[PDB]
């Protein structure tokens, strides 16, 4: 059988990045040829993998990690980088074995009054670490006093909303993003190409 | 109650090094995004540095690689060390709390440095 | 990148008028944007953020509203402590710019 693929990049909706998807895919044929031969993506980064010599190897799982950002925040989506989407949101570690794909959404995922449903983390008091999900909607403490729950001063919800409005410049306009992470530990491989 | 006070701004020979500090109640500076900003005599705002709760910091193109901001937990305190300085350099320097998207709403009263041969 | 204009650099009201002032971004900022006002010797003082919402404590004079490339700020009813200068600044952007300024000053 062949993989997945298809569920994962052209699935109807995509998640807030701070709640970001992860489809495992295993035991499949996976069919590289239709996403490197594609010419609907802006983005196509690998690292420590060759994209078009990526049908001959075998690996023991892929992951499918997708979500939505900025244009201006693709650039973050790769080992070694830092700002509100890499340190709170989706990190990759330095050792990243895999390749990150974008492409501009703005026709899907701006409305015309500004679409909210998109959400990122503004707040955390450490950076998460690569591959951490963190979904807590906690009142975030900016100073001495506790929140206990209740918004005000320096007590802030920690999600923000992006505001996806056709208008934006491209910079501003939603991005689709697909991370693949191939794995190869001491099990049987599941995963090859043609 | 809720206040940012900086200090240690002086007159300094271009080539020279000064560093600011801002001491912060009421706001834990680093559980805040943190910034300075600065004001030529007679020109708008320019923001500065930027340091973010966890750690990470950014800088403006005109003061990249000679200034460093840092801070110190124990001391609820916020630095700028300023290196290489230059004429253009001259400003009044804020220290100010980013409430997340740039939008800044507790101020310092802001130290005078001035660059001059 | 996004140059923010911001017009005009000096603006004669008097005590009571309604005031407004333009800032324009060289392309679209949703709704990031932010007001200040800073008098002489004085630290900026944070009026409004994301372009429509008044900062706790300002009086109901202020008004932010735009959407897209152009932004304003409306002071409903001038009062003698309004005479200053005010700022917008792009928000949720790499560059954190601020517009040039405007002098708000005593009409006679």
């Known amino acids: 059988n062949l993989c997945p693929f298809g569920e994962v990049f052209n699935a109807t909706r995509f998640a807030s990045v701070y709640a970001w998807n992860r489809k495992r895919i295993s035991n499949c044929v996976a069919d590289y040829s239709v996403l490197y031969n594609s010419a609907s993506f802006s983005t196509f980064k690998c690292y420590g993998v060759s994209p078009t010599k990526l049908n001959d190897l075998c690996f023991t799982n892929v992951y499918a990690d997708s979500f939505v950002i900025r244009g201006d925040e693709v650039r973050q989506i790769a080992p070694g980088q830092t700002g509100k989407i890499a340190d709170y949101n989706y990190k990759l570690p330095d050792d990243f074995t895999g390749c990150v794909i974008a492409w501009n959404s703005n026709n899907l995922d701006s409305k015309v009054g500004g679409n909210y449903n998109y959400l990122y983390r503004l707040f955390r008091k450490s950076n998460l670490k690569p591959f951490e999900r963190d979904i807590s909607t906690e009142i975030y403490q900016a100073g001495s006093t506790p929140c206990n729950g209740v918004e005000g001063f320096n007590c802030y919800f920690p999600l923000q909303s992006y505001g996806f409005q056709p208008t934006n410049g491209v910079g501003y306009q939603p991005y689709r993003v697909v991370v693949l992470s191939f794995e190869l530990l001491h099990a049987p491989a599941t995963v090859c190409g043609k | 109650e809720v206040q940012l006070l900086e200090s240690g701004g002086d007159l300094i020979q271009p080539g020279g090094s000064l560093r600011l500090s801002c001491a912060a109640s009421?706001?834990?500076?680093?559980?805040?995004?943190m910034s300075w900003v600065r004001q030529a005599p007679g020109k708008g705002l320019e923001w500065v540095s930027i340091?973010?709760?966890?750690?990470?910091?950014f800088y403006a193109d005109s003061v990249k690689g000679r200034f460093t901001i840092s801070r110190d937990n124990s001391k609820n305190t916020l630095y700028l060390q300023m290196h290489s300085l230059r004429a253009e350099d001259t400003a009044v320097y804020y220290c100010?709390?980013?409430?997340?998207?740039?939008?800044?709403?507790?101020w310092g009263k802001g130290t005078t440095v001035t660059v001059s041969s | 990148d996004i140059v923010m204009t911001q017009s005009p650099s000096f603006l004669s009201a008097s005590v009571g008028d309604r005031v407004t002032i333009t800032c324009r971004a060289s392309?679209?900022?949703?709704?990031?944007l932010a007001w200040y006002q800073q008098k002489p010797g004085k630290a900026p003082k944070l009026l409004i953020q994301?372009?429509?919402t008044l900062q706790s404590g300002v009086p109901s004079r202020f008004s932010g509203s735009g959407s897209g490339t152009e932004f304003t700020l409306t002071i409903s009813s001038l009062q003698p402590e309004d005479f200053a200068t005010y700022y917008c600044?792009?928000?949720?952007?790499?560059?954190?710019?601020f517009g040039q300024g405007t002098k708000v000053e005593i009409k006679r």
């Open positions: 100010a709390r980013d409430l997340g998207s740039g939008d800044m709403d507790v």
């Open positions: 009421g706001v834990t500076v680093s559980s805040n995004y």
């Open positions: 340091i973010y709760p966890g750690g990470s910091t």
């Open positions: 392309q679209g900022i949703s709704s990031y």
């Open positions: 994301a372009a429509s």
């Open positions: 600044q792009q928000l949720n952007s790499y560059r954190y710019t």
